[PDB]
Amino acid sequence: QSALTQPASVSGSPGQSITISCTGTSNDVGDYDYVSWYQLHPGKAPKLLIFDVSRRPSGVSDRFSGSKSGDTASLTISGLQAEDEADYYCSSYTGSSTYVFGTGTKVSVL
Amino acid sequence: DDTENASAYAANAGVDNRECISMDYKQTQLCLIGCKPPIGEHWGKGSPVQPGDCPPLELINTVIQDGDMVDTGFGAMDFTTLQANKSEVPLDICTSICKYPDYIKMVSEPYGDSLFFYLRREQMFVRHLFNRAGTVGENVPDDLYIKGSGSTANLASSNYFPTPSGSMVTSDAQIFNKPYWLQRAQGHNNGICWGNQLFVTVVDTTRS
Amino acid sequence: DDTENASAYAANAGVDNRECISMDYKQTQLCLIGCKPPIGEHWGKGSPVQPGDCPPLELINTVIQDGDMVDTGFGAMDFTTLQANKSEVPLDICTSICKYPDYIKMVSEPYGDSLFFYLRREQMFVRHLFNRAGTVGENVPDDLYIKGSGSTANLASSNYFPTPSGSMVTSDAQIFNKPYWLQRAQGHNNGICWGNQLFVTVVDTTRSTNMSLCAAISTSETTYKNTNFKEYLRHGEEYDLQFIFQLCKITLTADVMTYIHSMNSTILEDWNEDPLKKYTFWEVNLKEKFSADLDQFPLGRKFLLQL
Amino acid sequence: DYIKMVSEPYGDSLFFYLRREQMFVRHLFNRAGTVGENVPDDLYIKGSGSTANLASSNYFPTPSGSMVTSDAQIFNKPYWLQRAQGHNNGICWGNQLFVTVVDTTRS
Amino acid sequence: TNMSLCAAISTSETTYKNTNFKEYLRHGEEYDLQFIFQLCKITLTADVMTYIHSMNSTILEDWNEDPLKKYTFWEVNLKEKFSADLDQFPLGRKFLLQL
Amino acid sequence: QVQLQQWGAGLLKPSETLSLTCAVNGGSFSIYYWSWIRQPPGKGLDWIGEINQSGSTNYNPSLKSRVTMSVDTSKSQFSLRMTSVTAADTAIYYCARAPRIRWGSYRLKQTNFDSWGQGTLVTV
């Protein structure tokens, strides 16, 4: 129904631990753990990172973790590296049978 | 649904949630012998209403006839009129009447003509515990639960039904291929065949 | 979640993890006969702290009445008060008391009025092993396990509960549809119906089949639609009680009168408000239904064959 | 053919027989071939969408013999043919015998 | 049969919350022991006395510290529970009928 | 996962009708849904709608006034249409699978997207 609201630009030094932390509503993020994350390299197919708030598929860096609190989800990065250089888009399944997307956020190695 | 345990299902269709399901029936054996046709009991539509209201129930007595179906574990009832859905029960009883012998009446009639011998043997157990699909005619009282929020905002269907299972058919538990001697009838008719007649009613679901 | 064996998907924690679950109950069959109401026992809240503390637990005896639920594999307890959650047990006992007959008390009482004769059969096996949700009442002692790390850092709920199952109902194991002869009782009361009363308690979960029952709002629909059909449930019970009564006479001597007064003073007053008229019983009237020709009835014929 | 063999006028084909069977359905499956006989249209309510076409209604179970136990064995015991059911009381006409044995408890 | 029983922290709640309930387990056992005892007498001859001394020295001494004061037993005291009339109790009635 | 494919009207003019098609390879539709997602420049990702084998469709409430969909199991392909294309309709369209399933009659699982396509650029 409504786009999810995010910190559009984030940065840290090599090896730091930074969290993309991202906000929604009760109908999408609050009462439901249907949160997912995407990683967009320049002009490439979006890459699923985390689904069901804290589940990781195969082939993804174990450095990626998921968490939730209230209306706000999070995607934590441990040991900031080269491969982290990409956009991050969150997603959610609302109770009204619709899908939602975030503003996008971009990481930057200082 | 399958309410026995939390299962995994495809995305809900919303309308027409019907599946191809089969089950083995409750096991039964009986052999009534008398000089009058037996008597059976089944629930039917009773004495008299907005559309969709629950039909009244009544215990009806009717003469059992060749080809009348036997109780299958879904109850002895007149499915044709009590279930307008026509998909509540398997295919061979969805438009039939499942009747059960009325032993009380057939033993309490004065002359004991209808029944001077009978054996019975039946067993079953629930194999699966399913759930019905359709609008609820009687909402659960609010006194029996605490309101949910989010996923559990709307209660799931509470019309459960089990699928019977006859368990094991074995040779030692057989009633037939065996002579019975009618030397002492239960009632007052001690085997006399008035009118030169008999009526042997037999049910056997172990050779099905 | 299911603890019997690891499952593909596990509960994601949260605020409400309640599920739609059903089970078949423990199988039971009992018949008690006596001239006084039966007695039952159940675990109820005891004599009376912080909110949410464990209730005191006590054993209570109360007269069994028509409609009181029998124990069903979750124990004989007063769910209404011992489970403030209101969702620990199936829908038909979550606000009721499951009473179990107090065989010891009824048998051991001095006069044996409450139990001339009794039969019972029970059976059940665990069908599934589940887990409970909610804040932990008492934490597991730290000396019974070694702390984990990561996912295992937090212990899972340890409040296990099974779901019963009655197994097979078979015709050879039936208790009913047979004549019980009370020629000699256990207690001192050898079948005398003091006060012109009887109390026949019966439980029979081997004929507990519910009848699915459906109706159609409109017949104009040529294709099936879920919204067009209403569903219902119903259950039908059928009973028929036959008795054989033998007349007896009592000589009213001084000693007999004193003994009968000590045992129960109501008898002497009768022979010239109702204490039990606070309970719900299925009143059965046989005042106009006595007949002396036994052979005319099936139980009478059976009685004559054997005396 | 127990009925026919027992009903024989002379009783030559059967002096003495024992039998023990047991079975229960293990699984409930479905058949694939095209339906020979269409389900009558009056036994159900026509569906729509995915349920437009009926699934195959030719069900079949897979049996199971359940447990084989030593207490239920028939063999390794002497059978005394003191009196035959029929009229032939054990006489082996023509100097022949026929002993038919089936035993699925040692398979 | 462990019986799950729970208590709510706050009763002024309209929607179900896992954090609003505390869960407990309890188990209750019920027993009733009945005995029928018969009185016996022993003649204290020399042979009987020596045999009993060999069997267990404490019998004769008691017939004038607890050795089992190292274990945890459910102590049951029946000193005041003996009654001669058997027919008044169910086990006594069964015993009488069995003779 | 599976393999997706993309081809459609890459170049358009205002007030035209856009037509898309995607062909699943290495797999079948199964009981999963299939949806379309676009990334207009200066925007995020906008969800369009979804369609499974049986014809059931869910649409974005704002864009459902111009969006229509259909499926065909013969060639393993599902198509899209969106009339009255404007400048804001330019975006790198994508095709994604929705492995969402129901679990326990109350809550869903695997609600993410996956099998993302490389993408196709459509400009109006």
Automatic annotation (TrEMBL), chain E:
Organism for this UniProt entry: Human papillomavirus type 16
Subunit structure: Self-assembles into homopentamers. The capsid has an icosahedral symmetry and consists of 72 capsomers, with each capsomer being a pentamer of L1. Interacts with the minor capsid protein L2; this interaction is necessary for viral genome encapsidation.
Annotated compartments: Virion
UniProt function note: Forms an icosahedral capsid with a T=7 symmetry and a 50 nm diameter. The capsid is composed of 72 pentamers linked to each other by disulfide bonds and associated with L2 proteins. Binds to heparan sulfate proteoglycans on cell surface of basal layer keratinocytes to provide initial virion attachment. This binding mediates a conformational change in the virus capsid that facilitates efficient infection. The virion enters the host cell via endocytosis. During virus trafficking, L1 protein dissociates from the viral DNA and the genomic DNA is released to the host nucleus.
Protein family (similarity comment): Belongs to the papillomaviridae L1 protein family.
Name the record gives this protein: Major capsid protein L1
Taxonomic lineage: Viruses, Monodnaviria, Shotokuvirae, Cossaviricota, Papovaviricetes
